Amino acid sequence: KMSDVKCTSVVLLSVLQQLRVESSSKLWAQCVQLHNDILLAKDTTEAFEKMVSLLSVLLSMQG
Amino acid sequence: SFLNRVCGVSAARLTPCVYRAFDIYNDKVAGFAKFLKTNCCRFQEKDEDDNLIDSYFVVKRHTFSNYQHEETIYNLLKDCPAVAKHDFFKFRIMVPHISRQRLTKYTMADLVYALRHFDEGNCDTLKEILVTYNCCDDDYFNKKDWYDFVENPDILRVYANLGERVRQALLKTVQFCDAMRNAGIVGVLTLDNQDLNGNWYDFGDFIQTTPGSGVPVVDSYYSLLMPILTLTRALTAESHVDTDLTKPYIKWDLLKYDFTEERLKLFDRYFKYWDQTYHPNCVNCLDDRCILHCANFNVLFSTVFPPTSFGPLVRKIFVDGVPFVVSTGYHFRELGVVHNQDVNLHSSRLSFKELLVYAADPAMHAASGNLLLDKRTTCFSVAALTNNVAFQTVKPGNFNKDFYDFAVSKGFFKEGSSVELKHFFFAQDGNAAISDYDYYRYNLPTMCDIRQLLFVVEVVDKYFDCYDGGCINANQVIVNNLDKSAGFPFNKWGKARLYYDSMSYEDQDALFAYTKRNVIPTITQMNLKYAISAKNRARTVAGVSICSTMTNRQFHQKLLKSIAATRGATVVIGTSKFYGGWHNMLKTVYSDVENPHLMGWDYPKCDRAMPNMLRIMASLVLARKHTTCCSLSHRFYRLANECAQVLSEMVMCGGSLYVKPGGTSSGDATTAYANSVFNICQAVTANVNALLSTDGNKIADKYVRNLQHRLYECLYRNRDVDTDFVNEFYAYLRKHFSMMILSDDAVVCFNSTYASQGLVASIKNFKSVLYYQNNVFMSEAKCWTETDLTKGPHEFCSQHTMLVKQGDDYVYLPYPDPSRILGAGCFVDDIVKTDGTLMIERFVSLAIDAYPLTKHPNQEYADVFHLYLQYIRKLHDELNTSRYWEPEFYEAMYTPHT
Amino acid sequence: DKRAKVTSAMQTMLFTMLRKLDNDALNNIINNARDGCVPLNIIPLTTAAKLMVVIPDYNTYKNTCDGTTFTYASALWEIQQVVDADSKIVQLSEISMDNSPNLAWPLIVTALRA
Amino acid sequence: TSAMQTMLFTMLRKLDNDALNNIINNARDGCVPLNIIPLTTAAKLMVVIPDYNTYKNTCDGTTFTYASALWEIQQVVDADSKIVQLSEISMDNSPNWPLIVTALRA
Numbered sequence A: 001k002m003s004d005v006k007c008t009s010v011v012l013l014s015v016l017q018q019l020r021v022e023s024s025s026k027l028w029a030q031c032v033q034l035h036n037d038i039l040l041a042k043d044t045t046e047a048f049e050k051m052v053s054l055l056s057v058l059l060s061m062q063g
Numbered sequence B: 001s002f003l004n005r006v007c008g009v010s011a012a013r014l015t016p017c018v019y020r021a022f023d024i025y026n027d028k029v030a031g032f033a034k035f036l037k038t039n040c041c042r043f044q045e046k047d048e049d050d051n052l053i054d055s056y057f058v059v060k061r062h063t064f065s066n067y068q069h070e071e072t073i074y075n076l077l078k079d080c081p082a083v084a085k086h087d088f089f090k091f092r093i094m095v096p097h098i099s100r101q102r103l104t105k106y107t108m109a110d111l112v113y114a115l116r117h118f119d120e121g122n123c124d125t126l127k128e129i130l131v132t133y134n135c136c137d138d139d140y141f142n143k144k145d146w147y148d149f150v151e152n153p154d155i156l157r158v159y160a161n162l163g164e165r166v167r168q169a170l171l172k173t174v175q176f177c178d179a180m181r182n183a184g185i186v187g188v189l190t191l192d193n194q195d196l197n198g199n200w201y202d203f204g205d206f207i208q209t210t211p212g213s214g215v216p217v218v219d220s221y222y223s224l225l226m227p228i229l230t231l232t233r234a235l236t237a238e239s240h241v242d243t244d245l246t247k248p249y250i251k252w253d254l255l256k257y258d259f260t261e262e263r264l265k266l267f268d269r270y271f272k273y274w275d276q277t278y279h280p281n282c283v284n285c286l287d288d289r290c291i292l293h294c295a296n297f298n299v300l301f302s303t304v305f306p307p308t309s310f311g312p313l314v315r316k317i318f319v320d321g322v323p324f325v326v327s328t329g330y331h332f333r334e335l336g337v338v339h340n341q342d343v344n345l346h347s348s349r350l351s352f353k354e355l356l357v358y359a360a361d362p363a364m365h366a367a368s369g370n371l372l373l374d375k376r377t378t379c380f381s382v383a384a385l386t387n388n389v390a391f392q393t394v395k396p397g398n399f400n401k402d403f404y405d406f407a408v409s410k411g412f413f414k415e416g417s418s419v420e421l422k423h424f425f426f427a428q429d430g431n432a433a434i435s436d437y438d439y440y441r442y443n444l445p446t447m448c449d450i451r452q453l454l455f456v457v458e459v460v461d462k463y464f465d466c467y468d469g470g471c472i473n474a475n476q477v478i479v480n481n482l483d484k485s486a487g488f489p490f491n492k493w494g495k496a497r498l499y500y501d502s503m504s505y506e507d508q509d510a511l512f513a514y515t516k517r518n519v520i521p522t523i524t525q526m527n528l529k530y531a532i533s534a535k536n537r538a539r540t541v542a543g544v545s546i547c548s549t550m551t552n553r554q555f556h557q558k559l560l561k562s563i564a565a566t567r568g569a570t571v572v573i574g575t576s577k578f579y580g581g582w583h584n585m586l587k588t589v590y591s592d593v594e595n596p597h598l599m600g601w602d603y604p605k606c607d608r609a610m611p612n613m614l615r616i617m618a619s620l621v622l623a624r625k626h627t628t629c630c631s632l633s634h635r636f637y638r639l640a641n642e643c644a645q646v647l648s649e650m651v652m653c654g655g656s657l658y659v660k661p662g663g664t665s666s667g668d669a670t671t672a673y674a675n676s677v678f679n680i681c682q683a684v685t686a687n688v689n690a691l692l693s694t695d696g697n698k699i700a701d702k703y704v705r706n707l708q709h710r711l712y713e714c715l716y717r718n719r720d721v722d723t724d725f726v727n728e729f730y731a732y733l734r735k736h737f738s739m740m741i742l743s744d745d746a747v748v749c750f751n752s753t754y755a756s757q758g759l760v761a762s763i764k765n766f767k768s769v770l771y772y773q774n775n776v777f778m779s780e781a782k783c784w785t786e787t788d789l790t791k792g793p794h795e796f797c798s799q800h801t802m803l804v805k806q807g808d809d810y811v812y813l814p815y816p817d818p819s820r821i822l823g824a825g826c827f828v829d830d831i832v833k834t835d836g837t838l839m840i841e842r843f844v845s846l847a848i849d850a851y852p853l854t855k856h857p858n859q860e861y862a863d864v865f866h867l868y869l870q871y872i873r874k875l876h877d878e879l880n881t882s883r884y885w886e887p888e889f890y891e892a893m894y895t896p897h898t
Numbered sequence C: 001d002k003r004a005k006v007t008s009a010m011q012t013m014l015f016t017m018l019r020k021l022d023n024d025a026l027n028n029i030i031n032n033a034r035d036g037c038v039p040l041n042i043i044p045l046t047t048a049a050k051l052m053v054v055i056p057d058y059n060t061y062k063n064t065c066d067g068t069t070f071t072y073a074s075a076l077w078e079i080q081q082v083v084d085a086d087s088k089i090v091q092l093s094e095i096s097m098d099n100s101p102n103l104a105w106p107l108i109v110t111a112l113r114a
Numbered sequence D: 001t002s003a004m005q006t007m008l009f010t011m012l013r014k015l016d017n018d019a020l021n022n023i024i025n026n027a028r029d030g031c032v033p034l035n036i037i038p039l040t041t042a043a044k045l046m047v048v049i050p051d052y053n054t055y056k057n058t059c060d061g062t063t064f065t066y067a068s069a070l071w072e073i074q075q076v077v078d079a080d081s082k083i084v085q086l087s088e089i090s091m092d093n094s095p096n097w098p099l100i101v102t103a104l105r106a
């Protein structure tokens, strides 16, 4: 769906914010931009492309 | 052989050549409208090449008596260089002709009408004026939204290229008025008799008196011209050395704040024959209409002066032998210099009320802070109060997976269906607060039509005559939520509850009596808001200081509680939509309107772009309930405190102090009521501009033609209040333009044949009024029209309307966007995730909102209430008609028996 | 109850800001006025010792605070410290056109009056 | 904190995307990236590879597939921080390990 990937994007930015991503201005700004774009997306290919790039922020750390 | 006769008079090679705008006042018709031109001949002049130039030779024919009359008045005024050269000659077709020489294509009335009746796609004359006088190239218009102040702020530079021609027109009007007074000529100056080079040419309506005793009438000229003076920034040259654009700016003294003689010199240079008394300091004004009149001149002259001259005026004060910096006054852009009266230069102790006043004002904060140069914004930065800058962020929302899995279990969120997820908690990065603060660049210094505003304020005051108000004591003040914010310095030590518990009733009474003689400038704290939205923009709260909100409650609460308790009025603040209140509101709007349609509009950037003159007007309307309890000086100092506290306040935004240019503050409780006054003001001036710009010769109704003829003379010809005509125009507006106002949201029920004939306002008039009086472009895509009144208004306060059967009669019910209800259910704030009872109250509120969806023809909309009721039943099982787990509880909220 | 606690907090804050402000240049600015009344907006413009410049990109930095000293508000300011939005010290040699997509903009330049 | 991470993964698997499952299953095997996976074409991507079997599964030739997109190698920088050739990787040169790969989008 679209609602499922949008809700998963919200949960992903919540667990990025709990890992203190926002102590990095450059990293936090990129995550906010991807999350905002996913929440305003209309088709599922762009939203999943930005979901790839947002999940790569979480998998760049140690978990 | 007429063509070689006209150039036989004046040696210049000529080429021969419609709807023009006129300011008309006759015994037959009165208005500022576009009329037809039939009796004239225009010949154009050419350059050294065979290319046409802006010189025109207007030759018209007359009888013999007015030919002798024009000649005998032109021979007395010719020596003025502000007069266009006139050639008088007889041509045998013997008919006397009058040939004016080297006029422009357009007059000043064409410029003033084209900017006061703006229409996208019907603006050829404004484009021609902008191209002819080199403000912009022809290709500039191709760009989309070239006219829009918000989406293209380069149009301010384009319009400001026109300001030097307007200043020369003002100078030539003063020269022509001096020439008329020195020759003993009495006449009315109108904008259609002056071209865009500044020359005056029509002398038919002038009469002759003894020389030295001429009186030119210039109320209509100056007052119709006034919005163009700040739109084109016509007094830009007055900040340069010797009023020359080429010369460098005037280096004013930084210590200088008075500028009273400079304001008087500017008034004498540009408005010498304006006959009303101008007070540069509005403390010396006689009433509220005098304050409005003299504050309109101050907003034009304050654009000349350095921006560091405004704000609080500070002075070194010794408390118990210790040097202290305190504010002893204020230099307003609108009100001039205001001094405080209870200024003690030497003090022994510091009482609690004076300590509160000394902690509230920005003098001790900004005098001990560092200098700040913030290149992120264009607003005036005052001082950084800390060594660091705060970058606060907004977290995303807390996803409610239980409700979402329950909703997908019940068959929701299928693709291609009506109800989807559209409302989210948009997260914000570190640059969100200052980029939201940068939207105060949409507030521009705006001069109003003062003769029009002084009539519109008397009509708007008729909408507020049913309420009662006045000052109350501190023991009569009811505080709704004691857990509101306390403004900048006071939020470090508690909420608003601590300052109401600490201060005595006598302390609050003395603080309120201190504000009737002194100005206490305060600081507003702007923070980002953690809220759900459908758009990407950041939301902000504003915390006004406890001093301001305490004395404003004491000044305004009786009137605000009386407005919020009145049913059946125009302002519907405080009327609940429950228990049949939506139906009563809508039956009040369709009062007796005879050919009714419905109509709504929006105000783009209303919190930011609202002019300071209209906010001062709204405050004076709200302060008119104080004729018994307040003197004139007390009411002026209350106005000055409101201007220093919620209008031109200093804003703490991220550890730093800035200057707010104006606009409303979203944390002040008076903001909704001031927005309603502003809304009624814009609607009344849209109706005045619709009625005065209609050709009265083609108005068939004699009552309406007589009404516009009295409307023009009540604006521009009389300076007293015709109290009998204000009642008549208010009754006319109540009959044909019934309104429902709730804080800048509005529906009207208007007579549609009157709107097609141009007798009441339509969407076009609201667009024009917002363009010249608000510096915004209202698009028609956010405005709506509803021709069938069984369907309700398309949207009022984010609520849709349905006509359903309830009992034995058809009742209007309100319903929201179902996507909004599901998004509020699925995404939840942090406090609601902690306690499970708060989730039950949140879902009961959402099921109350979503109950009228069950009566919708769409079954998918109707299932939202059943989903919320089943989830409420589940939440109750994991934990009469007074039981919220049954549909009777939600049916009883929309039935008229309260 | 709370009146005594709020009074102490308000009183201590008023003295703290009072102690921070200089009294030589502040009395020099005030005494040149006729009636002893000056605008508030010129008090940190003329008497402050620190200047904080918040700079959003490199194009503003090369025009506003270039070199080790710059001129603003008719005074000379030598740069003491530059930090980024993450509050870490950025050296002067790091602020070029090359390295500016590695810097966390905005930069907050702290300067002292010469 | 732990509950949200477990909750995020449960829904993430529920979406069942090709690229999301690719990233999660290869990062389960130690093959995590170093920067953000870019979306524009011809952009940088640093990714570590800890095991030779994971190199066999991911890389084949001068190009490899990550997040259901094609990326071709510019140069591989090992733990010795110097350039490793394309044919230099072999099963007997794997004792001769975790080495980062830079690539661009096809």
Ligand SMILES: Cc1ccc(C(=O)Nc2ccc(S(=O)(=O)O)c3cc(S(=O)(=O)O)cc(S(=O)(=O)O)c23)cc1NC(=O)c1cccc(N)c1
Residues within 6 Å of the ligand: B423, B532, B533, B534, B535, B536, B537, B538, B539, B820, B821, B823, B824, B842, B845, B846, B849
């Ligand atoms: C679901 C929902 C959707 C939208 C909104 C909402 O606040 N809309 C807005 C209200 C006010 C303003 S204001 O600050 O300019 O006065 C808004 C401004 C903006 S904007 O200036 O950023 O474009 C946007 C919205 S929005 O519709 O949320 O997109 C604004 C609220 C809700 N919340 C509820 O309906 C709700 C939640 C809990 C209980 C109940 N009974 C109701």
Ligand SMILES: Cc1ccc(C(=O)Nc2ccc(S(=O)(=O)O)c3cc(S(=O)(=O)O)cc(S(=O)(=O)O)c23)cc1NC(=O)c1cccc(N)c1
Residues within 6 Å of the ligand: B478, B479, B480, B481, B482, B484, B553, B556, B557, B558, B560, B561, B564, B572, B573, B574, B575, B576, B668, B669, B670, B672, B742, B743, B797
């Ligand atoms: C339904 C209703 C009922 C009662 C009232 C009412 O009287 N409110 C208040 C009146 C006066 C004051 S005063 O202290 O500044 O004189 C209030 C102050 C405050 S506050 O400054 O302490 O927060 C709050 C309210 S409130 O509306 O009850 O939220 C105040 C308001 C409302 N509000 C509306 O009708 C409304 C207002 C704006 C938008 C919409 N959609 C609806």
Ligand SMILES: [Zn+2]
Residues within 6 Å of the ligand: B277, B278, B279, B282, B284, B285, B286, B290, B291, B293, B294
């Ligand atoms: Zn006055």
Ligand SMILES: [Zn+2]
Residues within 6 Å of the ligand: B470, B471, B626, B629, B630
């Ligand atoms: Zn009063």
